[PDB]
Design a protein around this ligand. Sequence first.
Ligand SMILES: NC(=O)c1ccc(Oc2cccc(C(=O)N3CCC(c4ccc(F)cc4)CC3)c2)cc1
Ligand SMILES: NC(=O)c1ccc(Oc2cccc(C(=O)N3CCC(c4ccc(F)cc4)CC3)c2)cc1
Lengths: 182, 185
Amino acid sequence: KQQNFCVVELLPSDPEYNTVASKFNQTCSHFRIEKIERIQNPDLWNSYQAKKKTMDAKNGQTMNEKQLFHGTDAGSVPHVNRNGFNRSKNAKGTYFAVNANYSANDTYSRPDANGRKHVYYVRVLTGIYTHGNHSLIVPPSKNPQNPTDLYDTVTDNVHHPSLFVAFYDYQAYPEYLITFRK
Amino acid sequence: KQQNFCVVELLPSDPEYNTVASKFNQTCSHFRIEKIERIQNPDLWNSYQAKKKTMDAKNGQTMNEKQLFHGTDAGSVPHVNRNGFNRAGKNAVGKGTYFAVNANYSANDTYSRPDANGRKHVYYVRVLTGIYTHGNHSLIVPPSKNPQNPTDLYDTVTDNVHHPSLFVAFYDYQAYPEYLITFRK
Ligand SMILES: NC(=O)c1ccc(Oc2cccc(C(=O)N3CCC(c4ccc(F)cc4)CC3)c2)cc1
Ligand SMILES: NC(=O)c1ccc(Oc2cccc(C(=O)N3CCC(c4ccc(F)cc4)CC3)c2)cc1
């Protein structure tokens, strides 16, 4: 699939704009939001909703999907817009933050030559997660009897998570991109 | 206008792909092209074709439009895709935008700066060069053609009026960033 995409800027009067800016300003009010855009990539979306359908049929009552933040540099934006976060420079999976302020750190959302920072608000299939360590390239197996079944994501803390690490293709859809500055 | 846009990657078999890769490799054969994309921004396009329509009505037989190269950094790409080269004055200065006849001027690391992954970005741009004169890297607007009539200024300035290698444009909607070439060394 070609995974072409369109970039739709949301109006400040839009309900989606206020929803996204609201979650971001929970921890990043001190920044100036320049624009919020929706990434419309039908192929990437279909692939994501397909893997969500499979997970929704496997985790029973689990609310598999969460909306999390991902800071990246300006160079990565056209590449995330097209390919999602597939087959990755993270921190060998992809890191997502519960709160925007982790992603607004200059190390991740590096200011570009014009001083602009980029943080995505991502639909992520966190699924069933366990505690991780920054040295896993695949998630651990749920059952030592059945190394078949691995966890979907890993986290820093299973009961009050602040970060999740995803490892599989089409596990995240970069729905909104926030461009801001200090 | 919102000036939203879509980014369509051309297939290596497309007639457009090899047309564009052909113009680029005239002077940049040593690079590897990773992908060629078409920027589809209807609002920016309509605005551009309107300003081409007026210029086509003013310069008689002049072939107003040329296809030129512009290297930029990865940070600028989402901004050019939406806004074109409209309104630091952070070009090769100066209130204008620099376009190269040949891609190798734009492929210089100073303009198409390699990003963290080593990728370089050069647009193949539709530019209304129009009627141009010689420039002197110190212009905020192009000079007026006639001192009798300071109304009508030139459309662009150039390094060489008869063998141009570079153009500077100063007005809004004078350039459309039709194709984006992503490549590496
Ligand atoms: N791009 C982003 O927006 C982004 C979003 C979230 C994000 O999480 C952070 C935030 C701050 C520091 C770190 C950090 O390096 N470690 C955290 C503590 C340790 C650890 C915890 C959990 C693990 F599973 C593995 C290791 C060591 C590594 C990670 C990073 C980037
Ligand atoms: N972004 C780009 O892809 C890009 C495309 C083309 C481009 O042209 C170049 C290439 C090499 C040097 C220069 C340069 O600084 N001057 C050129 C020589 C002099 C000059 C002559 C005529 C003029 F009207 C103005 C100035 C002094 C300044 C500019 C730069 C960037």
